[PDB]
Amino acid sequence: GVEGAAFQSRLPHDRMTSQEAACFPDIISGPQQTQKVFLFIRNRTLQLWLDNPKIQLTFEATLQQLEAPYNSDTVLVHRVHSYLERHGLINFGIYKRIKPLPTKKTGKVIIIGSGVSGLAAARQLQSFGMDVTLLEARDRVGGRVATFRKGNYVADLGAMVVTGLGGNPMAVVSKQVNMELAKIKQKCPLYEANGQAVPKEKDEMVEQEFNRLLEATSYLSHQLDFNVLNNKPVSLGQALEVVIQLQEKHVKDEQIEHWKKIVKTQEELKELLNKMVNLKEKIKELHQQYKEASEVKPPRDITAEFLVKSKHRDLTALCKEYDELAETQGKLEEKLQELEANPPSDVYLSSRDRQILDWHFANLEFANATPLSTLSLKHWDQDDDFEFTGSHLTVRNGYSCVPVALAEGLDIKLNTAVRQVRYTASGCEVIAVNTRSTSQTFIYKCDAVLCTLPLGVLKQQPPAVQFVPPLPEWKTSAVQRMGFGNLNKVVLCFDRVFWDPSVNLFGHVGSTTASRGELFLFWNLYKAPILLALVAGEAAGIMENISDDVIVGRCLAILKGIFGSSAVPQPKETVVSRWRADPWARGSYSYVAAGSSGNDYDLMAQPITPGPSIPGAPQPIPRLFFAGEHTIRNYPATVHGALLSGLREAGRIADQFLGAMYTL
Amino acid sequence: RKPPKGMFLSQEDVEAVSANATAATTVLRQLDMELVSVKRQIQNIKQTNSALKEKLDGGIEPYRLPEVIQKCNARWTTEEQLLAVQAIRKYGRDFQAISDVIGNKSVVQVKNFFVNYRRRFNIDEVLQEWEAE
Ligand SMILES: Cc1cc2c(cc1C)N1[C@H](O)C[C@@H](c3ccc(-c4ccccc4)cc3)[C@]13C(=O)NC(=O)N=C3N2C[C@H](O)[C@H](O)[C@H](O)COP(=O)(O)OP(=O)(O)OC[C@H]1O[C@@H](n2cnc3c(N)ncnc32)[C@H](O)[C@@H]1O
Numbered sequence: 001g002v003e004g005a006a007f008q009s010r011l012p013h014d015r016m017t018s019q020e021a022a023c024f025p026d027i028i029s030g031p032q033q034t035q036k037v038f039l040f041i042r043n044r045t046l047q048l049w050l051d052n053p054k055i056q057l058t059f060e061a062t063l064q065q066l067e068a069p070y071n072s073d074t075v076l077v078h079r080v081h082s083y084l085e086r087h088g089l090i091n092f093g094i095y096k097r098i099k100p101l102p103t104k105k106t107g108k109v110i111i112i113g114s115g116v117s118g119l120a121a122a123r124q125l126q127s128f129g130m131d132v133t134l135l136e137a138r139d140r141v142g143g144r145v146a147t148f149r150k151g152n153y154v155a156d157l158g159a160m161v162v163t164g165l166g167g168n169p170m171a172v173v174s175k176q177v178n179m180e181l182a183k184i185k186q187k188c189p190l191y192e193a194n195g196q197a198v199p200k201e202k203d204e205m206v207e208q209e210f211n212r213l214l215e216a217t218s219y220l221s222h223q224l225d226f227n228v229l230n231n232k233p234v235s236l237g238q239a240l241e242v243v244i245q246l247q248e249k250h251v252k253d254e255q256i257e258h259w260k261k262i263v264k265t266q267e268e269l270k271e272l273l274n275k276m277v278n279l280k281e282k283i284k285e286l287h288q289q290y291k292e293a294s295e296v297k298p299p300r301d302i303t304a305e306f307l308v309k310s311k312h313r314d315l316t317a318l319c320k321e322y323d324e325l326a327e328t329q330g331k332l333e334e335k336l337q338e339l340e341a342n343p344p345s346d347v348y349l350s351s352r353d354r355q356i357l358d359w360h361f362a363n364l365e366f367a368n369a370t371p372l373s374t375l376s377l378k379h380w381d382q383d384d385d386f387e388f389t390g391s392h393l394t395v396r397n398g399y400s401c402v403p404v405a406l407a408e409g410l411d412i413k414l415n416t417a418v419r420q421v422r423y424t425a426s427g428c429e430v431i432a433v434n435t436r437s438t439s440q441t442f443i444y445k446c447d448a449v450l451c452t453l454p455l456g457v458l459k460q461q462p463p464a465v466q467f468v469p470p471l472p473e474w475k476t477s478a479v480q481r482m483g484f485g486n487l488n489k490v491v492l493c494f495d496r497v498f499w500d501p502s503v504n505l506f507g508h509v510g511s512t513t514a515s516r517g518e519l520f521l522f523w524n525l526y527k528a529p530i531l532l533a534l535v536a537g538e539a540a541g542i543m544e545n546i547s548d549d550v551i552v553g554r555c556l557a558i559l560k561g562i563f564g565s566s567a568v569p570q571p572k573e574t575v576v577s578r579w580r581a582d583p584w585a586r587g588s589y590s591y592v593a594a595g596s597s598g599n600d601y602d603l604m605a606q607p608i609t610p611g612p613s614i615p616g617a618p619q620p621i622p623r624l625f626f627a628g629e630h631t632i633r634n635y636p637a638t639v640h641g642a643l644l645s646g647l648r649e650a651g652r653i654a655d656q657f658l659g660a661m662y663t664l
Numbered sequence: 665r666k667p668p669k670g671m672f673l674s675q676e677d678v679e680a681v682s683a684n685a686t687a688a689t690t691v692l693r694q695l696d697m698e699l700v701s702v703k704r705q706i707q708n709i710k711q712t713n714s715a716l717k718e719k720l721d722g723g724i725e726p727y728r729l730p731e732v733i734q735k736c737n738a739r740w741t742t743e744e745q746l747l748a749v750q751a752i753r754k755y756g757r758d759f760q761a762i763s764d765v766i767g768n769k770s771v772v773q774v775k776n777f778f779v780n781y782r783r784r785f786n787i788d789e790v791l792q793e794w795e796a797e
Pocket residue numbers: 112113114115116117118135136137138140141142143144145157158159160161162163367368383416417418419452453454457464465487488579583584585587588589627628629630636637638639640642643
């Protein structure tokens with residue numbers, strides 16, 4: 001309903017967000033009934049936009065389709081609609097414009113980066129009547145949304161998965177832009193180093209143990225507060241290892257107390273046989289004595305007759321004892337067959353196990369684009385509460401179609417490497433060079449700069465971009481603490497399909513812990529005959545030191561083992577990526593490093609305000625703004641998160657240079 | 665509140681494997697050796713108990729002699745009286761043994777005997793001298 005519009009806008013349908021309290025402090029401090037009116041007007045406009053996102057939702061259109069009592073207060077509707085349009089919750093992306101843009105434009109913004117965050121802001125700022133120029137080091141838009149295209153072969157070297165349309169701003173874009181979105185069938189067959197499928201027995205057993213060990217770290221994290229060790233923060237991998245050890249410890253304590261039940265019963269039998277052997281020796285002697293006393297021929301006197309009867313009683317007595325004791329000896333020779341037939345588990349994990357478990361860790365290092373040794377144990381998954389709902393998809397016509405679609409109608413300078421950012425109390429100038437002939441220098445003057453430089457670029461020492469004046473310590477320390485990791489893709493282009501076409505993705509189990517990332521996974525995703533092979537973890541940063549043929553070699557090897565040494569043709573075309581190599585990226589995407597938190601992701605997003613030119617002049621405007629995947633706490637390292645942060649800063653900048661008339 | 669079921673995770677266990685770098689590898693060799701230590705000790709007592717089984721060969725079957733089903737009578741042949749006093753001298757108050765020696769007197773006729781012929785057989789003096797041993 002209307003409540004679905006609020007879910008799909010990432011908004012609680014029955015509560016005002018902290019954003020809305022900032023813009024509407026009258027209402028949220030006011031009576032419960034006004035809050036509900038507002039919340040309905042908010043959700044209802046969202047539904048209108050969401051129901052048709054290929055055309056602008058003007059304020060007139062909106063008020064038209066509310067009814068009383070909700071369409072009574074026109075300024076409350078105009079305030080809500082303005083708010084929405086401003087922070088990119090409606091009329092964002094690629095919509096036909098009803099009210100064509102004003103002829104004269106207010107203020108001037110330079111935007112470093114034509115990445116998806118860059119385009120998303122540029123596209124909104126121009127939407128707001130501003131002057132927006134985009135500076136681009138590459139010869140193409142999109143940034144880390146790269147798409148290979150030759151002939152009919154198509155394959156993203158960058159993002160390729162839309163992580164599911166339940167509340168995903170990308171869901172809106174895909175209606176706006178032609179996107180061939182195909183669901184990803186989640187079934188993944190594993191195949192050992194030899195080439196043989198892992199049996200359904202194993203493949204379930206390890207995976208549950210994997211999942212079990214993760215939760216174990218999480219319990220170590222929050223319940224046992226195991227978050228520092230030798231005065232350093234604990235990492236995920238570091239604690240996974242402590243958890244595997246404590247399970248290997250348990251298997252041993254479990255054999256020790258079991259075999260120790262056997263010695264505790266073996267020596268019951270030792271003591272029992274020792275009675276039984278010394279009792280047979282007493283019996284052996286009385287039988288002799290009773291024999292001799294019975295040898296005396298009658299008629300006997302009575303002491304000699306008592307001696308026969310007596311020794312007889314006494315032998316029947318020691319014959320009960322010995323019979324009772326091989327009764328008891330029966331119970332203990334059966335308990336020793338019991339225990340020696342119910343041994344506890346022999347190992348914690350076998351080298352065939354720990355090697356398939358290593359493939360589940362390669363997956364987790366692929367997910368986070370970093371060795372598990374570097375992720376924060378406490379925080380590596382703080383962004384899990386904001387997951388979308390629905391199937392994960394791929395883009396079958398290539399996902400560059402989205403940046404290119406956004407870049408329409410925008411002022412983009414390609415081949416333009418920003419090299420110095422200079423921001424002062426009265427404006428900013430950005431200094432770029434031409435990437436081809438680096439002598440040729442450019443100067444751009446502007447009211448504000450929006451920096452969507454990758455975190456890896458920002459991390460670069462010595463700097464690729466100089467800030468004048470330098471970024472404050474609180475910003476540079478967030479830049480050092482944050483994590484920017486790495487993963488790479490090998491694209492394999494054949495003339496014919498030779499894999500299971502009903503299987504989107506199938507694994508490869510690696511021989512080592514060290515090489516668990518090396519070519520550990522393959523995707524059939526496309527119409528065409530393209531398999532796409534991933535390199536994760538510690539292996540990611542190392543395969544970049546190795547030529548394409550050597551890499552495509554190892555891939556052909558790996559596939560022969562699994563599909564047969566003669567079904568694997570030569571690849572017609574091959575592409576290896578090297579994202580840590582790439583100087584306009586210097587990595588793949590961010591990760592919550594040990595010693596970092598999601599709080600750093602928020603430091604990354606605070607604008608910079610230059611000091612006053614004239615000492616004692618009033619506190620100026622902020623001039624330098626930050627967007628990009630590393631700036632959005634609740635959706636980091638994604639595309640939709642980039643998008644969202646560009647939408648965010650475009651609202652922030654406009655509220656600054658255009659004023660926000662909707663907060664009264 | 666509590667772990668996944670099967671993970672073993674005490675506050676105590678955790679610190680013991682953290683105390684230093686190879687404090688993991690350490691405590692897992694005190695256990696691999698505790699396990700060999702018991703494993704060879706289990707192998708030992710197996711052969712000690714296998715030798716003591718061979719001595720018990722034959723059981724006690726040569727040595728066992730038949731049961732005498734005999735109907736329990738009432739009157740006290742002067743023979744049975746005399747068996748009694750000697751059984752009292754050798755068995756004290758164990759009225760079960762004495763009824764097995766005499767063979768056809770119930771354990772209560774045995775107890776009766778103790779008071780009837782208590783006078784005439786100095787049962788008291790006899791018991792004193794039984795207790796000397
Ligand atoms: C590198 C790479 C990135 C992504 C993917 C794949 C690769 C190889 N794909 C993969 O399946 C993995 C996946 C994903 C999904 C969830 C997670 C996750 C979930 C939970 C927890 C943790 C993680 C992880 C992975 C996914 C995907 O499917 N969909 C997806 O959602 N985002 C994916 N991602 C991320 C996405 O790819 C990127 O996060 C956005 O693309 C961000 O872009 P943005 O920050 O806007 O910025 P940019 O970097 O794109 O643009 C910069 C511009 O600046 C230019 N520039 C530089 N320096 C200068 C200079 N000096 N002067 C002038 N210009 C300069 C540069 O040349 C470019 O022009």
